[PDB]
């Protein structure tokens, strides 16, 4: 059908302004702290501690197969990133200080992009 085609279009689209909101926030984390799954080699109790692990490298994968129908979804892993962070270690700590700035600066990306998901449509 043609109404299925324009969903696409538009599921194409939010998957384009994603991928640049994703972009954007990865550059918050110059430091490469959030890039790749925590290593279950080397934290072997992550598991016990954090139940639904989350990293840059694993969102792009699901934005790429068009896997988030809606910014909450997208927003939904960000968070998961920093909340897993803030709670595994302590607030001394570099990875700790690192998700807050993330949150922090990553704020005023998400601000503008539901700004532009509800705008463009």
Same mark, same amino acid.
């Given at each position: ?28 984390? #110059? ?12 934290? #072997?109790?992550?598991?016990? /501690?954090?139940? /639904? #692990? ?29 909340? &897993?962070?803030?709670?595994? &270690? ?32």
């Amino acid at each position: 059908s043609m109404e299925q085609v324009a969903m696409e279009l538009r599921l194409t689209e939010l998957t384009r302004l994603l991928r640049s909101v994703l972009d954007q926030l990865q550059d918050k984390d #110059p430091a490469r702290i959030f890039a790749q799954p925590v290593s279950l080699k080397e934290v #072997p109790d992550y598991l016990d /501690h954090i139940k /639904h #692990p989350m990293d840059f490298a694993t969102m792009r994968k699901r934005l790429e197969a068009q896997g988030y129908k809606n910014l909450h979804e997208f927003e939904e892993d960000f968070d998961l990133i920093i909340d &897993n962070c803030m709670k595994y &270690n302590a607030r001394d700590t570099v990875f700790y200080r690192a998700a807050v700035r993330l949150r922090d600066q990553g704020g005023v990306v998400l601000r503008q992009a539901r700004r532009e998901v509800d705008s463009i449509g």
